[PDB]
């Protein structure tokens, strides 16, 4: 359970870093 | 580019994680 | 700013993998 | 193994993001 919510954690990170990459 | 480049490292890692967590 | 907390959420991340590994 | 091995990643991914951050 805390290896799955780590994932969900990275996912989230990657958007907000192709969200700063797009700014 | 370096941005969106770990973004996909982060995506990918987290994928490994969630087989990790299936195992 | 968003870029150093994000870099402070992975290392906090990868402690607790480390921990996960070590039982 | 694995685990430890993703740390080191995001550990150096968490670095990078530093230094881009940093200019």
Do not use: V
């Amino acid at each position: 359970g805390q290896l799955e919510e780590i994932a969900k954690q990275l996912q989230q990170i990657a958007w907000q870093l192709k969200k700063i990459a797009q700014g």
